[PDB]
From a paper:
The system includes an inner membrane platform of GspC-E-F-L-M, a periplasmic pseudopilus composed of GspG-H-I-J-K and the outer membrane secretion channel GspD, called the secretin. In this study we used cryo-electron microscopy to characterize the structure of the secretins from V. vulnificus and [name] and in addition determined the crystal structure of EpsS from V. vulnificus.
First, we determined the cryo-EM structure of [name] [name] as the paradigm of a secretin that is assembled through the actions of the ExeAB accessory complex. Analyses of top views of class averages revealed that, for both secretins, symmetry is unambiguously pentadecameric (C15 symmetry). The resolutions of the resulting symmetrized maps were estimated to be in the range of 3.4 Å for EpsD and 3.7 Å for [name] by employing the gold standard FSC criterion. In [name], the sequence corresponding to the β-hairpin is absent and the structure is finalized by the β-lip, a common feature seen in both structures. The inner membrane ExeAB complex is both necessary and sufficient for the assembly of [name]; in accordance with this, the Aeromonads do not have known pilotins. In our [name] sequence, for example, the conserved Ala-Phe motif is absent and is replaced by Lys-Gln, residues whose high polarity would not be able to play the same roles of the two hydrophobic amino acids of the motif. This indicates that the C-terminal tail, which includes the region discussed above, is flexible and not traceable and most probably does not fold into a stable domain.
Author numbering:
A (entry chain G): 97 to 149
B (entry chain H): 97 to 266, 292 to 306
C (entry chain I): 150 to 266, 292 to 306
The structure:
Amino acid sequence: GDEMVTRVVPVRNVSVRELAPLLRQLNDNAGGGNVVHYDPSNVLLITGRAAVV
Amino acid sequence: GDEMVTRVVPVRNVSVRELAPLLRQLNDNAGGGNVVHYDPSNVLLITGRAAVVNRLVEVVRRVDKAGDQEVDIIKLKYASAGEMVRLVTNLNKDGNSQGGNTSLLLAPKVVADERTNSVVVSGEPKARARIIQMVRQLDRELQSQGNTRVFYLKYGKAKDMVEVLKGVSSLAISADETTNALVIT
Amino acid sequence: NRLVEVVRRVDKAGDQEVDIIKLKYASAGEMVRLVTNLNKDGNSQGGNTSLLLAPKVVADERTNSVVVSGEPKARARIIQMVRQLDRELQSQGNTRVFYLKYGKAKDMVEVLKGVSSLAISADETTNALVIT
């Protein structure tokens, strides 16, 4: 539920760059403590509580 | 806990430049005494108290393991690595692009060796997962009927027939004078 | 104290060393070709990426040695890739020799040359066909 952990899924098919408004918007969706960021290697790395993640 | 130490993790997969807002923001997250900075040689160097650095280095190894790009080699026993290459090369955007913000030049790519007949992958574990499937998809053998057949002619002479068929081709023919058979491909 | 801390830090923050370990089996040049298609292992013109300063891959065919230039994460994953492609052949090679029993190797070469026209020779002595 409130468990703050970092977990990482790539978007292989597409450049993950297209989820930057979306997922940092999901940081911006509810109570913070979140990180979203993007590799040109096109893996999408996350940090946050269990639900937001 | 409050132990102020410097420790350094590279992001090999990606240029570490992308954690500059994030990690100096983690300086900016709580009570200061922090340093974050970046080598173009793409190691990420930190200074700070034990916790702030716990979640900093968390970010760094994370971004590091976020974008894996390893190679897997498994032997192909059957269909040609070069045909394997050609057919899959037309799978453009399996890492083969000039995409800008996409950066698809950092995405998984496909290869093969014809000395061992080995598929070569370079990229993601999703690429390991799906290209071990594509290894298996084309590692199929021939079923009896090949590309090349040999016709045993009974009443016709193979050497004379070659000339006849050469017109039709003019496809690659020779006739074996001994067994009087025609080898066309 | 904490200035020079920053400096040695930024110094070890972007490591770039080389590692040389012998390949015993499959060709360094093939090793080169197959990995060269791993573009973005240091092989790019990327701006703020600066991937021209990221790890790159090489080989020698005189010792048959892999050469790396970059990170220890590159040492870690390219010593894996050394081992992945350093596998030997399993009995069946690229080239086979067929012993023909009722057919003559020199005569068969010309027959097969059509099929190829793939690289053939026939040994007059043991009357065998060597195709690759």
